[PDB]
Amino acid sequence: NLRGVMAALLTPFDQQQALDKASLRRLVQFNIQQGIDGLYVGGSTGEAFVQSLSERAQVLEIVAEEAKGKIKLIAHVGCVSTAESQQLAASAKRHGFDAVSAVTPFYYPFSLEEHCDHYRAIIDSADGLPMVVYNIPALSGVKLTLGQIYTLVTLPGVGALKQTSGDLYQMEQIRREHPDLVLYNGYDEIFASGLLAGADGGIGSTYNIMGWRYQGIVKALKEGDIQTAQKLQTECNKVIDLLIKTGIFRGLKTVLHYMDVISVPLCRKPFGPVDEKCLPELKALAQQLMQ
Amino acid sequence: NLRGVMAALLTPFDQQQALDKASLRRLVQFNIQQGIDGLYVGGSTGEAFVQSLSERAQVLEIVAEEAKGKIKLIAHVGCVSTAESQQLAASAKRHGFDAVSAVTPFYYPFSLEEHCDHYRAIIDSADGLPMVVYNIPALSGVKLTLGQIYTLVTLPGVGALKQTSGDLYQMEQIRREHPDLVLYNGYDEIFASGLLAGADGGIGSTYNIMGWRYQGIVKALKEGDIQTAQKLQTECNKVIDLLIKTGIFRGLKTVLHYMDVISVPLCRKPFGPVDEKCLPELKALAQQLMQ
Amino acid sequence: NLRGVMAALLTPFDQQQALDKASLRRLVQFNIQQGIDGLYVGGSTGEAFVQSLSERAQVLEIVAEEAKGKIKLIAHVGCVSTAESQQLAASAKRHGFDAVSAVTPFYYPFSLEEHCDHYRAIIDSADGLPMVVYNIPALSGVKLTLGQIYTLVTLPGVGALKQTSGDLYQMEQIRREHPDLVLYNGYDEIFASGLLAGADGGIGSTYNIMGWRYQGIVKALKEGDIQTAQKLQTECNKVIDLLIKTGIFRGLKTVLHYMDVISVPLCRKPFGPVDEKCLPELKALAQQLMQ
Amino acid sequence: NLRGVMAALLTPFDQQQALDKASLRRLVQFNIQQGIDGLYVGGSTGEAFVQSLSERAQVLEIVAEEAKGKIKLIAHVGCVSTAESQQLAASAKRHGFDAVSAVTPFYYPFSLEEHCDHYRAIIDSADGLPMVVYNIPALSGVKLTLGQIYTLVTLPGVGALKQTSGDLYQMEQIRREHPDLVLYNGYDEIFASGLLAGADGGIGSTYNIMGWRYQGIVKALKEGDIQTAQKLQTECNKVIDLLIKTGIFRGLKTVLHYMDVISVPLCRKPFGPVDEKCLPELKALAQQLMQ
């Protein structure tokens, strides 16, 4: 029941870089109205790694008040520390999320065995909530082989893998060895290709502004309309080329600010403001998506 | 007119590691009988880099003898040396190949300017044959950015790009920037996803023993039967998994030996022999391929 | 006055993973007794990335209580978040440290200007304490160029650079460009070579158990006796060889526990316990070091 | 008796990019005039990968005729092909070279076992000449582990390792493991540091225009005077910085030309020409070295 298209939720801040609750509530609602299947919260996109544990739990609490019952909720409780991750797993459960997820612990190198214990511990603290193993080499620096992936996803309590890797040979080997595994395509720019290789859904940050297109790509491939799938993917890719140039999170928040969802589109330091020169393309995009 | 599905041709040898002329003609014939659209000869797969210019020009000659007019023919002409590359390019036209191709020169680091001159010089010597730039970062060590690729494929005389890269975001970006460029998918393992991304054909080493499967995928995608395409790609990938374990070239030659095509399944040193323990799966692979 | 050999301090925990203050004090005193020039506290070795801010500030406080005025004290105040880093810099000034330091913010990619602004802000908060830029590509994933290093190293308030990089061409290039820069060699396994290249001194994990050997390498090069300098480096590398196999932090802690300096040799999860098979060698190492 | 400083020999060419025999001999004798212990010929620096086998053999001969006797002579005989490597090996014996050498075969990926059989075959064809294994990750793309290096250098017939790696911890581990092994430092910019870590000699391209400085470093460390070893390496690096900016092989030949050793400082295609804006620096350098 976790298969699907889930937006990786952004965290709106106020001018003082404090949580902007009203914009967070707006953002959750905006996503629901968009037809999203669920939300992945407290992930990279939520700026979790520049947030405190209490701040991350406050967010989980607010979106559950806002979305529990309406759409699927996955809480990324991942920290480098197993104990901090367990604390967040207990809050996700306490607030009613449908699953937890954790990036592979980073900075310090850990063995495959250390990664398994880390996941086992979080799973135990999740008290029943399935675990979403999260592989994202580019940001974490943890290069996971297919064999290591097999070990992690076969752990008791692991019901899914968020694959943020562009290796689509591995995407299909994973699907072939694990037929029942929920597999989330992680890179928005290769979504269509990801689904064809074996992913059965996706989690992405750009879904916050055009989640309807990814759902569109999914319907297309289902209705055997490769052509429409391709057109949707390239329109997504033109937006991603832009976001990548502007700063992905700040870029997304800016489009959202112009759509009246977010009050102040600031990311937390050390992230800087969006380059003034980008605002016109961003303003235009906002206009274009609203219509 | 050169867009399509082209097998990267293997160079058969005898026990003394010398070109086995008779097996070569048999292999070329076998490829044609599978309904392949053309042959990419003298590339990585034809063991070009452990062959002299004269043995390379000799294979060009024989294959052209065997298939000029029957199917399209692309001659890979690259060498680290610009002058040796030019020399093979003249043989290509001289033997009537439809196009010429050249891997980005490797080992020594070269600038973008130096790489362009390398292709211009070769283009000059190909005397009218369109050039197929060849990007294969994993083996050449040359990682081309989107812009370096832009600069190279827009070189006068360049009519295509062989993209042996698993980055399908780059694949669609290239397509979106060069809508008229011929785009061959380099990694067989991701063929279906590659076409979906924007590639309009493919060149691959495994097409030698199951090229029809890739044709079946082209057709299935055109016909909107995504299901069969995936099925086909899965079946191709089960085979590729095996070949990567056994060693790809020697594994393909061994299979072609069980199909009668090749007499002696040897690659040239430093390539070592296939593992005796592998031969049952390879023999059985051949058997079922006789489907 | 910041030039010298400083031990990268470990953080002793109890069986319940909480700070072991009595062992922390012993370790500080142990290092002072070894004739160490100072301590670098709250860095990677202190397991700072699996500690909360409050915990990190508590360690800063206890170490100053034990060592202020006795040896130099540098506070690694860095976090990905600029704000958290500022909070730690203020605690460092509050407790009387001689300097502050911060690793290049990681996980999320940041531009050079974003990095400069992070350091400036932290420098502001340190209220007078100079800054030691910390470059450690292997763990952070940020491989600075000599150019970026120059920009960071020239920021107002930056008094030194901790170079945990094995590229000794860059070390001498940095020394050539900044003849007045305190340059700490960060990879213990190449200390002698690093010093020869231009390193001014060093900061390291292994200094906790054999800091006198590093002091010996300094003196030997100062006396042109490259013969004993290599002897010393060789002994250090046989130990580093073992530590890398056992897990560095836990191996150091195990040796320190066997030397009755710390009560419990555990690291926080996800680091796992030392493999029982390694204990015989760690016990013997501890024995010989004590002599 | 192979230990020592050996210049990696450039191969002068004429305007037609053909071998400039008179300039070759002039360079050979010029290295002798400097006081080199031997010359490493037919390697990266000799532009061997952009030369035919016969051209390579021809160079081996001219150099031998000019030097079999006055200095030590090592013949880089490596090709991707083992057979081509064996051919050059036989020629190495024929002109009476002191030792043979071969880069790990590149481009295609090969197993340790294949690399092993490749070296055995060449050793064999070297007819008793000792083999120098050549590890140069950055150009070959072959990253050797300590364990792989161990297997290779303990192959019967192997007498040395040319280590073109900036990993000085690996350098020291190699020395500790094979104290009888001749270990050549491959990167000129870290010569001082490299010998300190355990290399007993060195092979470099910049030795051609300043072999004496390297010889001076070796003596300076023997006489236990790190002071002038550093100052010497600093000078070598100020120069190396320039050769990197200008293009190394072309930058060295150009200096040699202003020193009246080589007729035309041209490298073969795809190497481009030296930027006209650099000539003042290169002349001024050619001027200062002359003393």
Side-chain angles (χ1 to χ4, degrees):
Chain A
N1 68 312
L2 295 169
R3 309 178 186 298
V5 171
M6 256 78 103
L9 193 75
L10 283 335
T11 299
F13 297 122
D14 74 15
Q15 281 295 164
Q16 295 73 59
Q17 290 178 71
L19 169 64
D20 177 345
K21 293 181 69 177
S23 299
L24 211 213
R25 301 197 188 92
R26 244 172 270 146
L27 179 57
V28 166
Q29 297 305 333
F30 179 74
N31 271 282
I32 294 162
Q33 297 299 62
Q34 202 163 164
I36 202 60
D37 300 336
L39 296 171
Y40 183 83
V41 20
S44 319
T45 300
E47 276 178 78
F49 306 122
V50 58
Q51 286 186 103
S52 73
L53 297 188
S54 55
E55 291 177 323
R56 290 175 60 175
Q58 175 183 42
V59 166
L60 296 180
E61 173 167 38
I62 304 319
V63 349
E65 301 187 314
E66 295 286 313
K68 188 175 173 186
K70 292 67 180 300
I71 48 167
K72 307 290 180 300
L73 262 15
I74 303 168
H76 170 76
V77 304
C79 301
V80 173
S81 151
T82 304
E84 292 180 339
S85 298
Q86 296 180 283
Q87 167 183 151
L88 243 22
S91 302
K93 172 64 172 167
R94 211 203 101 199
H95 284 300
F97 277 66
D98 301 293
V100 294
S101 181
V103 260
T104 50
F106 47 89
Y107 190 74
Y108 305 109
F110 298 107
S111 72
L112 170 55
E113 191 189 332
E114 284 166 326
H115 278 109
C116 291
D117 290 343
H118 183 254
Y119 283 107
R120 292 184 183 106
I122 298 164
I123 283 172
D124 176 86
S125 296
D127 193 35
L129 279 47
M131 167 63 79
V132 182
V133 175
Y134 181 18
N135 180 209
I136 181 157
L139 298 184
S140 84
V142 176
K143 298 183 179 301
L144 286 182
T145 64
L146 214 221
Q148 298 179 306
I149 289 190
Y150 177 95
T151 297
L152 295 170
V153 298
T154 59
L155 292 166
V158 170
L161 174 71
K162 175 177 194 265
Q163 253 297 260
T164 294
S165 165
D167 189 334
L168 304 185
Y169 172 28
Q170 192 179 85
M171 185 74 81
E172 100 66 50
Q173 293 175 112
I174 292 170
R175 167 54 71 216
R176 176 147 43 91
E177 279 317 297
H178 306 103
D180 300 359
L181 182 70
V182 170
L183 227 203
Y184 302 108
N185 172 80
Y187 280 127
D188 299 19
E189 328 73 87
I190 64 176
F191 185 72
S193 287
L195 301 188
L196 182 59
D200 55 24
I203 292 170
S205 77
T206 71
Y207 298 12
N208 289 289
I209 62 178
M210 55 197 196
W212 65 86
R213 300 182 176 171
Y214 298 100
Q215 289 284 206
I217 285 162
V218 165
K219 300 180 180 180
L221 298 178
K222 181 182 298 180
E223 298 182 300
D225 186 352
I226 53 292
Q227 199 67 176
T228 303
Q230 287 191 314
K231 182 179 180 300
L232 292 160
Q233 186 69 62
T234 120
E235 279 314 293
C236 291
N237 287 185
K238 299 176 175 183
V239 166
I240 294 159
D241 284 7
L242 170 58
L243 293 173
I244 286 176
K245 280 183 170 172
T246 61
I248 303 169
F249 305 150
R250 53 160 69 122
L252 286 164
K253 283 174 174 185
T254 298
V255 169
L256 289 170
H257 172 252
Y258 292 149
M259 295 180 130
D260 271 298
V261 180
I262 287 179
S263 299
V264 185
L266 272 172
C267 279
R268 300 222 295 206
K269 296 288 189 179
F271 280 113
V274 180
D275 183 78
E276 301 179 300
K277 306 175 183 178
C278 307
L279 272 1
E281 300 185 67
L282 289 170
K283 219 292 148 37
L285 172 54
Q287 158 69 193
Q288 149 71 344
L289 292 169
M290 303 203 251
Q291 76 98 184
Chain B
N1 64 305
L2 41 189
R3 58 81 59 181
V5 169
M6 260 76 108
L9 192 64
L10 278 323
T11 300
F13 300 114
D14 56 14
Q15 280 289 170
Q16 289 66 52
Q17 298 211 304
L19 177 60
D20 163 345
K21 299 172 182 180
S23 284
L24 178 61
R25 306 195 200 93
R26 241 180 300 168
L27 185 55
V28 163
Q29 192 56 201
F30 190 62
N31 266 298
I32 284 173
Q33 301 180 60
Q34 296 185 311
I36 201 66
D37 309 334
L39 301 182
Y40 184 81
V41 332
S44 307
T45 307
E47 286 179 58
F49 300 113
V50 293
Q51 262 178 154
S52 66
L53 303 181
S54 304
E55 308 169 313
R56 282 180 73 176
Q58 181 186 194
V59 156
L60 294 185
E61 184 173 74
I62 282 91
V63 60
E65 307 185 325
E66 281 286 322
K68 185 288 181 179
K70 301 181 181 301
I71 54 181
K72 301 299 180 180
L73 285 314
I74 308 181
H76 172 255
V77 131
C79 296
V80 172
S81 181
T82 300
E84 308 184 321
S85 302
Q86 288 175 277
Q87 173 178 159
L88 250 24
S91 301
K93 181 178 183 60
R94 181 173 307 145
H95 286 287
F97 268 70
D98 305 308
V100 124
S101 190
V103 69
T104 58
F106 52 88
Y107 191 82
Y108 301 107
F110 289 124
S111 64
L112 177 288
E113 181 179 0
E114 292 170 303
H115 276 101
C116 291
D117 290 3
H118 183 251
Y119 282 95
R120 282 176 188 120
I122 300 175
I123 279 167
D124 189 288
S125 296
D127 191 41
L129 282 67
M131 162 69 83
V132 183
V133 172
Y134 183 16
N135 184 212
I136 181 162
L139 269 24
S140 72
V142 186
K143 300 180 180 60
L144 299 188
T145 63
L146 217 213
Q148 298 169 309
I149 299 178
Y150 176 90
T151 299
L152 290 177
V153 297
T154 61
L155 247 21
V158 172
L161 172 67
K162 184 184 203 285
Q163 252 302 261
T164 301
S165 163
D167 181 343
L168 294 193
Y169 173 28
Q170 193 176 76
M171 181 74 89
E172 89 80 37
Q173 276 180 127
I174 289 180
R175 174 52 81 203
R176 169 156 50 94
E177 182 74 310
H178 304 94
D180 294 343
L181 183 74
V182 172
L183 243 194
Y184 301 106
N185 180 80
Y187 286 119
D188 304 358
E189 313 86 82
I190 65 171
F191 199 67
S193 303
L195 297 176
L196 186 68
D200 60 16
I203 293 168
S205 317
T206 68
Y207 298 10
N208 279 279
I209 65 152
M210 46 180 221
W212 67 87
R213 285 182 167 173
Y214 293 99
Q215 289 288 205
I217 289 170
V218 169
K219 299 180 180 180
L221 291 181
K222 180 180 298 180
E223 299 180 60
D225 185 3
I226 176 279
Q227 188 75 182
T228 50
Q230 295 183 284
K231 187 284 288 61
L232 294 181
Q233 187 71 64
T234 302
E235 284 310 313
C236 288
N237 285 188
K238 287 176 184 176
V239 167
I240 293 172
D241 277 9
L242 169 65
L243 295 170
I244 292 178
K245 302 186 209 91
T246 69
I248 299 168
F249 301 160
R250 66 169 76 111
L252 287 166
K253 291 187 182 172
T254 302
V255 165
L256 292 163
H257 177 206
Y258 288 130
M259 300 174 119
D260 283 297
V261 184
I262 290 183
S263 302
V264 179
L266 283 294
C267 283
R268 306 241 278 229
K269 295 297 142 285
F271 287 86
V274 179
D275 198 27
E276 301 179 60
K277 79 175 183 180
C278 292
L279 302 163
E281 289 187 77
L282 288 170
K283 192 167 189 170
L285 174 42
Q287 314 297 306
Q288 81 159 301
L289 282 185
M290 247 70 112
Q291 60 176 186
Chain C
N1 70 309
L2 284 196
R3 169 186 180 180
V5 171
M6 334 285 267
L9 200 69
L10 286 313
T11 302
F13 299 116
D14 61 25
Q15 282 289 151
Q16 282 64 57
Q17 305 218 314
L19 171 69
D20 181 349
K21 308 177 183 181
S23 295
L24 204 222
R25 298 185 189 110
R26 281 164 215 143
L27 178 58
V28 165
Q29 295 307 330
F30 183 62
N31 272 292
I32 289 168
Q33 298 180 300
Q34 292 182 76
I36 204 67
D37 301 322
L39 302 170
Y40 183 79
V41 3
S44 312
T45 304
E47 290 173 73
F49 295 123
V50 287
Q51 296 183 98
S52 71
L53 288 196
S54 175
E55 295 169 323
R56 282 171 73 175
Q58 176 183 212
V59 161
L60 289 184
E61 187 181 3
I62 291 158
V63 178
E65 288 175 1
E66 292 297 306
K68 193 289 181 180
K70 184 63 180 60
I71 61 302
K72 301 299 180 300
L73 254 21
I74 297 165
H76 175 68
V77 148
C79 312
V80 177
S81 155
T82 292
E84 297 176 352
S85 298
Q86 294 182 282
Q87 181 174 137
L88 245 22
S91 291
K93 192 290 176 59
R94 173 178 167 178
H95 297 306
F97 278 70
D98 304 284
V100 155
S101 186
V103 59
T104 53
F106 52 86
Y107 189 81
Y108 298 120
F110 294 106
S111 60
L112 173 64
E113 185 62 62
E114 287 179 315
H115 275 115
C116 288
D117 281 25
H118 181 78
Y119 281 107
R120 292 191 186 101
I122 294 160
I123 291 201
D124 178 81
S125 287
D127 187 21
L129 284 39
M131 169 67 88
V132 179
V133 171
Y134 186 8
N135 176 214
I136 172 170
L139 270 34
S140 70
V142 188
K143 180 181 180 180
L144 305 172
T145 71
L146 186 180
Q148 307 176 324
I149 275 155
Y150 167 83
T151 299
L152 291 182
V153 151
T154 54
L155 288 170
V158 162
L161 164 61
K162 188 197 169 192
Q163 255 300 264
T164 296
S165 166
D167 186 345
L168 296 190
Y169 172 24
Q170 185 169 81
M171 187 70 78
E172 98 68 47
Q173 284 175 306
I174 289 167
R175 169 54 68 204
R176 172 138 46 86
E177 182 70 13
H178 313 73
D180 299 299
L181 187 72
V182 174
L183 233 199
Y184 305 108
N185 174 91
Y187 275 126
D188 305 9
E189 324 80 274
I190 64 179
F191 186 74
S193 288
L195 283 186
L196 184 53
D200 200 27
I203 293 170
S205 298
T206 72
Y207 293 20
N208 284 278
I209 67 177
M210 47 185 215
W212 64 93
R213 285 174 182 181
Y214 292 104
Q215 286 299 194
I217 289 171
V218 162
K219 183 178 181 179
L221 297 179
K222 177 185 177 182
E223 300 298 62
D225 176 15
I226 81 175
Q227 208 56 63
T228 58
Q230 300 185 307
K231 190 290 297 181
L232 286 176
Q233 186 68 56
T234 293
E235 286 314 297
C236 291
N237 288 193
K238 292 169 154 200
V239 167
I240 289 159
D241 267 21
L242 174 62
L243 297 177
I244 280 165
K245 296 174 191 151
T246 70
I248 302 174
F249 305 161
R250 51 158 84 111
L252 289 172
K253 288 179 171 184
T254 297
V255 169
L256 287 158
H257 170 254
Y258 292 147
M259 291 170 161
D260 293 323
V261 176
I262 70 167
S263 304
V264 191
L266 286 292
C267 291
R268 309 225 293 196
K269 290 300 178 75
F271 290 98
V274 179
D275 189 323
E276 298 181 300
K277 301 179 181 180
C278 298
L279 293 179
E281 280 165 273
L282 291 170
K283 292 197 190 171
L285 167 55
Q287 245 312 294
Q288 72 153 293
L289 287 179
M290 300 182 85
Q291 289 152 301
Chain D
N1 82 306
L2 250 30
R3 169 179 174 184
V5 179
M6 330 260 111
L9 198 63
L10 294 284
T11 117
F13 298 112
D14 52 40
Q15 281 292 164
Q16 302 53 50
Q17 304 210 329
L19 171 58
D20 181 345
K21 300 185 183 178
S23 291
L24 213 200
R25 302 189 199 94
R26 263 166 290 179
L27 178 50
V28 167
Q29 293 306 327
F30 179 67
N31 273 298
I32 280 43
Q33 296 181 60
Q34 297 185 111
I36 209 67
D37 304 323
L39 300 167
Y40 188 74
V41 68
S44 301
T45 303
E47 300 184 53
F49 300 112
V50 110
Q51 290 186 53
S52 57
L53 297 176
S54 87
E55 283 173 293
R56 290 175 69 175
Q58 167 191 160
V59 174
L60 291 183
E61 192 179 61
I62 300 280
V63 178
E65 305 177 335
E66 289 293 299
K68 180 179 181 179
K70 182 64 179 181
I71 58 163
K72 300 298 180 180
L73 262 31
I74 304 167
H76 173 64
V77 163
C79 299
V80 174
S81 185
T82 304
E84 287 179 21
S85 299
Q86 296 178 273
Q87 206 181 102
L88 254 32
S91 308
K93 177 60 181 180
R94 217 172 312 155
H95 297 304
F97 267 75
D98 298 309
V100 155
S101 180
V103 274
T104 45
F106 48 87
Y107 191 91
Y108 299 111
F110 298 111
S111 66
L112 210 209
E113 296 181 60
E114 294 167 331
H115 279 115
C116 278
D117 289 338
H118 172 82
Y119 282 96
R120 289 168 193 156
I122 302 162
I123 290 163
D124 177 351
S125 303
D127 186 59
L129 266 51
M131 168 72 80
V132 172
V133 175
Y134 182 19
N135 175 225
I136 182 166
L139 310 192
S140 69
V142 185
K143 301 72 189 64
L144 290 178
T145 66
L146 224 211
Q148 297 168 321
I149 290 176
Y150 181 82
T151 302
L152 294 168
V153 304
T154 58
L155 230 43
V158 173
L161 184 71
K162 183 185 193 306
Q163 255 296 275
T164 302
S165 166
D167 188 338
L168 292 202
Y169 172 33
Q170 197 177 72
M171 188 71 81
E172 100 75 46
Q173 291 174 114
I174 290 177
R175 172 50 81 207
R176 178 150 43 90
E177 258 290 306
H178 311 95
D180 297 300
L181 185 65
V182 174
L183 238 197
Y184 302 101
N185 179 80
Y187 284 119
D188 309 28
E189 324 79 70
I190 62 174
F191 189 69
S193 292
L195 301 166
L196 183 50
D200 55 35
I203 296 171
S205 80
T206 71
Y207 291 6
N208 285 282
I209 66 164
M210 46 186 226
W212 64 90
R213 288 189 177 166
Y214 293 100
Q215 284 298 197
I217 294 179
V218 174
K219 181 180 180 180
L221 296 172
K222 185 62 180 180
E223 303 177 300
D225 163 54
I226 57 168
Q227 206 62 17
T228 68
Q230 287 179 302
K231 299 297 292 65
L232 284 190
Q233 182 70 65
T234 300
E235 281 311 312
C236 288
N237 292 195
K238 289 211 190 94
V239 163
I240 285 177
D241 278 337
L242 187 63
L243 295 169
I244 297 304
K245 285 180 174 181
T246 68
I248 290 152
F249 304 162
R250 69 174 64 129
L252 291 171
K253 290 182 165 186
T254 283
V255 170
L256 289 185
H257 171 275
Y258 289 147
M259 279 179 188
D260 287 278
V261 186
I262 294 180
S263 298
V264 178
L266 151 71
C267 299
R268 315 221 296 193
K269 295 299 186 176
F271 285 104
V274 178
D275 185 310
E276 300 301 300
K277 72 180 180 180
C278 294
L279 287 60
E281 283 188 287
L282 294 176
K283 330 181 183 192
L285 178 60
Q287 311 296 286
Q288 53 180 296
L289 276 304
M290 300 188 113
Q291 54 140 205

